[PDB]
Symmetry: C5
């Protein structure tokens, strides 16, 4: 006998947008997977690439779960009412442009899902973009302030073609995508920051 309104209110009433949902005291496991949608502006001279991708972000806050037996099992919730991982693109050279409604999806089991479409410039290896082997641009995305003990990242290795959602009208094509997990520490501080290194192998389509 619970409607979507009741569900939302319960989330607001128990969620803390500025507090990380640390269960017991292990880190919060965040899953991050990108699905390239397009590759626009490209410069082999400056090694800069403009790209659009759907950043599928998933985690969980069990303090928000309800009984979906006779109630909706999911609801969209403004991300501002929810705690969202402070993910950041380490080699980005421009703020991310969120092209889609900043709405998240909360599941009755406490699972939270946020998958916005983002356009952002990157500084990566662009050389070879016009060769057969193409170029390989690596994008590192992970928490900015939360280290491993508090946040952990892992690619969603679920099956899905590299360019499953890639634009056909794009001047380029995706050869292969490989989302690996990686760590990043600094000469100052001990704790390491987990990230996902996404390698996008793409090249310029040549007319026959």
């Amino acid at each position: 006998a619970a409607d979507r309104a009741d569900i939302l209110y319960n989330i607001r009433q128990t969620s803390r947008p500025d507090v990380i949902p640390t269960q017991r005291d292990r880190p919060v496991a965040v899953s991050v997977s990108l699905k390239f949608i397009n590759i626009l502006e490209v410069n082999e001279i400056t090694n800069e690439v403009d790209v659009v991708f759907w950043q599928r972000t998933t985690w969980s806050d069990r303090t928000l779960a309800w009984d979906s037996s006779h109630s909706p099992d999911q609801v969209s919730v403004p991300i501002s009412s929810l705690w969202v991982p402070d993910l950041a693109a380490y080699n980005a050279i421009s703020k991310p442009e969120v092209l889609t409604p900043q709405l998240a999806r909360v599941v009755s089991d406490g699972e939270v899902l946020y998958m916005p479409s983002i356009r952002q410039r990157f500084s990566c290896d662009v050389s070879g973009v016009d060769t057969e082997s193409g170029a390989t641009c690596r994008i590192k995305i992970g928490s900015w302030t939360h280290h491993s003990r508090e946040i952990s990242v892992d690619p969603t290795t679920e099956n899905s073609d590299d360019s499953e959602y890639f634009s056909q009208y794009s001047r380029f094509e995706i050869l292969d995508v490989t989302q690996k997990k990686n760590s990043v520490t600094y000469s100052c501080c001990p704790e390491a920051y987990e990230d996902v290194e996404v390698s996008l192998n793409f090249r310029k389509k040549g007319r026959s």
Copy 2:
């Protein structure tokens, strides 16, 4: 009898901008109709266009109804005070730029109307743009987080000149526009999201 100040006050009193106005347990009937007003920047090599259209969006929210017997049966309300469908252009390469005041129109029966002027850039086939056959750019629009069970999108099929309000000073011209109802799915979830496929057909206005 109550006036505008009362109605508006009451609307703001009962509007839940973050909760989908699901009457009973059926999707919200959102009708979408794009009205191309101009076609600016256009590139055939990168398949990219900059368009200005009026996104006529329509839906109902019974919770906002009231007796208009002896009072205004229509008022302008800030879309921030209302729940608004979370639409997105699945093939947009730039966030939508609302060029007009973000005001919606509310009718006593609960029929909400919002139609803003939006300039945006999409990724689409532009080939032939400089021919008599012209180019056909297809733009899909639908909810981003709400599937068919939560939201339905049907093109407000209004038989009208596809260029009824299209600038005459544009370097291009419309041959014909068609808006079909549609949907998409992904490799993660069974739920399908309804959209609208506005197929634009235009070519550069030859200089004769």
Copy 3:
């Protein structure tokens, strides 16, 4: 005797920035006139132009009035503290960049004056810009959501210098400016929306014989 501090306070109470001050059942009369200040990037190929102009907007909101007997009859108030017409440029291709402070002038008789300096890009006939007759760019401005029964727009046309405030350093010169009242009923709905057509006639300077 009340001061400006009070006048403002009392105004923030009776003011409803989201409620159009209709008089009984009389549409709100809003006067709109542009005072062109400059003409920048003029692309005769895309029929696009960047214009800077002061938009003098007037209207009355009795619910704002007060006793100017022993108090100032005029004060400057933030536009968010009161209702403001949802004017728009129907043929604008860029958002209206407001260059000046967004404050309006309020008179104890409820008369409201708002005159912002705006930088904006429109789509219009730019052809002929480099000819003796020049080009004639028409800008259509009106309420976006309030139709004729709610908002009535009329240009405060009066024998004035069309280029009175136009920049002398501009690459262009104003041949003539005319503001006409118009109306548009969309083939969807009955209500007719009022607007003002400002036809700007201008050309490049330093032309040949």
Copy 4:
């Protein structure tokens, strides 16, 4: 004997940012002085300059005064918690861009000092910019809505080096900067609006 916290706490308890601090009924003596920091862009053909400057602005608001005989007599406050003069550049062709933190300095005696660094484009005389005598670009800054009786603008004309803080790396050089006062009346209304006409005599750098 109060402290920073008290001084601020009290400011918001008395400050009215929307109310001009008119003592009795004499206008607010606001002083404006520009300190040109750079000249980034200049168009000889279209008569437009893009410049950077520090806008030293001073006025008084005794309703914010406090006894600093046993506490600081100066504190930095966000201009958002204070009333501020509604100055504008009558010949500005782009909205002002404040590069520095929007903070003012309030002295225990009610004196207020706000000096932001600004990047802005103006329409002015560029002719002669490439000659030994240089060009003269006048910039008129005054209140946008408060006529002479409410606001008065007077430049603090003293002995200061015109290009004292001017960047040595700019492509131009300051020849002289005279800051005169002026009154601007309108063919609409009787009262005039006091303004300050800053004359920036500069030329392009080009020695032997």
Copy 5:
């Protein structure tokens, strides 16, 4: 004992973001160090550069400390909840483009750390950029409204590779980075303003 929610809750219970936390009556010690990431745009004619760096900002705020005996001694906190130094690059010709989540790291002892990746444009010496000895662009950063007796800025001599995080895909390379502590007094007031001067010696790459 307490959770992260308790920590933050209390932080916002005693934090005065608009008040400088001057321990006793002495200036706040703000440590500032730049960690260069990239050198994008460069114009030797206009003497302007586009730089991306991590501004490692550090200071202490005793009004936020708490017991971490059986609780965490660190949390990520939105900077909107803390007081933050009003730092500003003097020769910056564009406002800072914060590319990362605006979160600060606070320790149980009141230590605060904020390291935002920033993309910004400066007016400095670009001459020789294309020579072997490269160019030396000096960047000056310090408080904007707080003088030496309120805020003191000093570069953490944390020796390390100057191009430790510098992108290897940049068109340029770092030859040397030196960060000296300096001071500046303006012909307005006797109070001096501390700042750090970061000299970045770089050049365009190439092949031997």
